[PDB]
Specification:
PDB class: protein binding
CATH architecture: Orthogonal Bundle
Largest sheet: none
Radius of gyration: 9 Å
Assembly: monomeric
Order of helices and strands: HHH
Keywords: helix bundle, protein binding
Strand content: under 5%
Entry title: Backbone Modification in the GA Module of Protein PAB: Wild-type Sequence
Shape: globular
Number of helices: 3
Distance between the termini: 28 Å
CATH topology: Helicase, Ruva Protein, domain 3
Name: Peptostreptococcal albumin-binding protein
């Protein structure tokens, strides 16, 4: 049950942040909360 993870990555692509390194990070994240935290950090980093 990690659909929020792939949605996070898709949403990240939608934002325009195109780097597989971040996708590896998000996929390495053990929990959905980690996924969201990562996505938010990445977002703030390239916002």
């Amino acid at each position: 049950l990690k659909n929020a993870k792939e949605d996070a990555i898709a949403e990240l692509k939608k934002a325009g942040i195109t780097s597989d390194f971040y996708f590896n990070a998000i996929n390495k994240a053990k929990t959905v909360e980690e996924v969201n935290a990562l996505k938010n950090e990445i977002l703030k980093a390239h916002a």
